[PDB]
Amino acid sequence: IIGGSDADIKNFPWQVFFDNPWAGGALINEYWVLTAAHVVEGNREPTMYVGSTSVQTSRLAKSKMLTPEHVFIHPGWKLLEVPEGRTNFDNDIALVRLKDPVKMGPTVSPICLPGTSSDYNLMDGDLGLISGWGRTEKRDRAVRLKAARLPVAPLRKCKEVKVEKPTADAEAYVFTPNMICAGGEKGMDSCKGDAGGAFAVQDPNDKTKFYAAGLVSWGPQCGTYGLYTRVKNYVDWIMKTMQENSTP
Amino acid sequence: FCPGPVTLCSDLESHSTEAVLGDALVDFSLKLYHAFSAMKKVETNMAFSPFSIASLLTQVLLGAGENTKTNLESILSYPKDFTCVHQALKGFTTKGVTSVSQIFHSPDLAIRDTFVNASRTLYSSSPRVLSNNSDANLELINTWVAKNTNNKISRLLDSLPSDTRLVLLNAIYLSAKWKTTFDPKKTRMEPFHFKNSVIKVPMMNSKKYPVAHFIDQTLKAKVGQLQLSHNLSLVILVPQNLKHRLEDMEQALSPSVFKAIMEKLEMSKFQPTLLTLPRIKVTTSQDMLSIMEKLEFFDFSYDLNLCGLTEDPDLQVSAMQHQTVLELTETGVEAAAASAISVARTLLVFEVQQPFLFVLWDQQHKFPVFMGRVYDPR
């Protein structure tokens, strides 16, 4: 979270923290956590934490750790592809099933999901919040939670001049309609260590709640612009996954 | 009765038992770890080489018989009639270390000729004789070790018995280093959790070091791998939270968990990781006879049956000592590879800042070369 301010865990009780893939997450209900596909890519069993202002090593031992049961990746993702996502990050979304339910309180409560109507269709002029322990301007690691307000920018401002030759320059990053562009204002953006964070947007119908409109996926030079996974396009897959893998 | 000297195996038969040898070298390592922890204090560093140890035990198993031949096979997790283990062990030798295995005997212990050559061929060393007075035998052993170890292991023994008849020795140091050099300018004093306080130890640092890692649930620990030279690699197992003591991680390591983790690391790709860990510099001298009794092996002090080596009826192991001098600092091979550009908005990290367990692994023949723990980097 570059260009952002401090924020207690009460500002983002849905913000899950991930260890091996030092990344972010999003609680949606008592049994499932939403994150990016590349977050739980090479780690089929993440290390998750909730309800903590700080992620000091002295704090994670006294914070609630979630025990995952199974990791569900969206089928439109890459596979054994060597870390460099040179091909794409299309369908960069994943669901994590928890073995134990989550007791909700003042520092842990889940965020809503985007509705299937057309009001939830993101566009210019809309605003959003990003929260994560990613890299700010000072250090690469944020011990206490940071947050910044980002507007939905046109995807034209995303396609930027960034080296895209991890291996064969022939491979070119493709931009899909399943991605949302944001940032630009005051240079506020999401950097390394924010993947899986929810792009919290206020519900247009119930203006007191919030819903995860995007998940921090990829982008060029951080601090400029980037790409968040459009969650509205995967609402049918999240529901078809939570109901099939019932809790018997 | 004594079973005759063992028969030489063919190159394909011995190459066929490579998968058999690599599996018993894992079961035997775990038995040595539980023994070493039961002998040292509760929170002490230790480093032992389970490979060089078994290389000398099978050198003994060559001339054993009756109960001594079977107990050595059950201690070393060997199958019966495993006649190709001697040649298979010689082939497992890695150039990343420099180890020695000698057997010293008093002048009144006659060595059979069927073993003088069988030890000089299958292990390149015949039994060496000792002097007459015990005073010269002490310095004769330490100098022979200080000569054939490039002056690394100087004081392998602190004392020798007056009635010394049978001495087993093995000293090994690590000459291999990292395949990727560490920057010494980035060596910052980072905190390190010790006991319950926070001590500061010298720690190496690298923003994009190639580390293949993941999480294992059976251990509740982060398992990372680092690439050395000579087809060697150092595996490091750190508990996830501080809630899990290293002791709880020790009691959870089974032969199944071991083999289920090394086979998952052989198929996990090395990725540019941000890494921070203290220097590894552990030396451990240990009376190995105390280890044999800690594994319910009471043959070296009672009812010793070594007919293939000697025909002496009254024979017992007078001493047996091991020393491992493992050291790894900011020295490496390929300075760096760079080539970074990951556009993903995530962070990859592996951090060893608490008591941990390390295993130096040989990826080629698949077996643990070294094995130990570090409770205090100081």
Added chain:
Amino acid sequence: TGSMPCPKEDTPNSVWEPAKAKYVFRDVVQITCLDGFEVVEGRVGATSFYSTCQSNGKWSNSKLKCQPVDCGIPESIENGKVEDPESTLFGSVIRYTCEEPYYYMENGGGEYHCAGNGSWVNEVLGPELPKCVPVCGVPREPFEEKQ
């Protein structure tokens, strides 16, 4: 000899199946309790029992009386609570609620009433207890963008 007849019985919670009148000696009757009642034959509550007009002129099994069915103290639910009523007998009604800002149930759960079978039931949810799932998207502390 004179077969002494057994008189009838004030049966407010029971009904005599043979019924008729002038019950003669060696005449068994099925005393069945109504919905919401059970005869505790000393152990498990069965819905009915039997009584025979003996040679004296009174009914056997007179120690059995149809008593109100007890539903028992209601079992609590996860992230929920229920107020202890005055009685746990038939017809008594209880009420389940969730937590205040972090749970809201499903709905719907219009309270539960002790039924005749002996279980607590709701109009639609039946014998199924309500569940308290989290009230989603509730920021405990509003986030002020320090600028």
